[PDB]
Amino acid sequence: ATNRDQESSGFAWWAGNARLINLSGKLLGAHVAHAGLIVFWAGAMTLFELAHFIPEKPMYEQGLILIPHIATLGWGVGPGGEVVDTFPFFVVGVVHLISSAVLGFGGVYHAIRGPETLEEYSSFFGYDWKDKNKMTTILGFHLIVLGIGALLLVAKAMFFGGLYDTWAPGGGDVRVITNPTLDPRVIFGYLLKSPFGGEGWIVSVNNLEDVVGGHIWIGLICIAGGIWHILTTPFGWARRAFIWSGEAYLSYSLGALSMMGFIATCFVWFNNTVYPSEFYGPTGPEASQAQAMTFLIRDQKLGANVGSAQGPTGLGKYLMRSPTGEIIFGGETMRFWDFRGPWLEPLRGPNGLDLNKIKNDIQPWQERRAAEYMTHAPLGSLNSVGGVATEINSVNFVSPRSWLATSHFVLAFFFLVGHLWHAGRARAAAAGFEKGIDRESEPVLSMPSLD
Amino acid sequence: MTILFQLALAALVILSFVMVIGVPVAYASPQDWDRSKQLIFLGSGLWIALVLVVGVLNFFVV
Amino acid sequence: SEGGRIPLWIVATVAGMGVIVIVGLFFYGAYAGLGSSL
Amino acid sequence: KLPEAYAIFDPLVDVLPVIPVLFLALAFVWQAAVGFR
């Protein structure tokens, strides 16, 4: 039982996995087995969702988070996001579940049967964390793999059926992307946009051409970077800037993942392009705007002049100006005027919402959609009672946008905490005082008094 | 075919359960490793074959 | 009669599983019969 | 719904997603067996 107790390893049972830091074979096993767990969940959860799936109910009324991911890719759906064929979901589920057996097999083998260290067995697979070049090489392999992934999304979009496009002319539908945005001014332009209101950084991406072109750029960048890191070794300045150890690299990755988690939280909360409202439900902004639309339609049918109707505060009851003058919906939803969605845009002119189009051009499908979204706002209790906090039991609903946002905020936060933990520890261990202060060499005792 | 399908799938589930318990026990057991190893090979090949059989027969029952 | 015949880890495992079963039942009951809102 | 041929496995499919959680609990059963050394 090599290194498998606190006395030999220096680590207690509750930190048992730290016993794996310099045991590359077993650690490889832990990693592969963990990947197995992930893939397992994707497959099993997909089959579970499918079994519980009623095709004529919206997805978002059914507690689905994976089927939406598949449908967004253009599998199984047609015009308006209607399910025309569930077989693709079945396929994704089964194939992930089967693959998880393979991964688990490898993981278990390397973890309890294979060579505990890889170094004496193979120069290629063996490594020293402190070997900077080997680290950059493996980093490179993995970058090339990621780049290939991004390109697989590009291939789906351009050559294998397309993607679901909520913005397609004539109504949402699956569409083939033939002209991805390649212009770097557009692509990296998103990267330089403010993350505040009306800008929203990369979260503002609002068309599939930009999504696809962006993925072309990311694919090429990742492959090029991978080659770079295979062919080079870290420069002097990097060598002097970083801590070079397993726990340090782990801490770096933990910070990166925390960042990505916060970003994904915002993406699923605000974006309705790569998270189509057909599949995920309306955004919070979307549903608020939809209420305003709904009552404008009702009152105007009754005979109200919605342009000139003055509300109790002096602001327009239905319509008002944004701080830069655009015509927007009134009431509290004044906050959400940056909202954009395919059911609303046809009423939009150069100066914002257009009163003539509002008076004459609102179609029954727009009324329907606004009613649907208004009554599927992402508000609901922990036990899945839909609606505001004071609503009575009756509707079993919590929006997938809420589930996704909340889960990923929690995960991102604890991952920031983990970054602090492992970064601070890596620093202390590299310097040699992670176990405590040397009584015979307490640094503060050699320092001058503060006063 | 439906019979052949259902039975092949039952076989896959049963075998999977057997492997799930037996593979880690064999890996960590002191004795009888040669027979164990032979059996793990056999079980793996059969597992793969069964997945393929269910996969193909799926389209003649669905 | 004397301590040790039934390993503690087995006792703990079975005890814990029992806890999981009973609490699981209590959560089931939140969705069915009295208190279910239906 | 799964395709009809697979309907008999419905109770099984209902249980699958929780299995990963069982691995975390298994680590504790294992550690208890070696005295948390």
Partner: peptide
């Protein structure tokens, strides 16, 4: 409903059964 519980019983016992079997045979836990 009984089927679900049966499944999770077998599945649920699989993990502890492996530890038990290894413990009995003095395996490399």
């Amino acid at each position: 409903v009984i089927a679900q519980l049966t499944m999770i019983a077998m599945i649920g016992i699989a993990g502890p059964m492996i530890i038990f079997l290894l413990a009995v045979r003095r395996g490399n836990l």
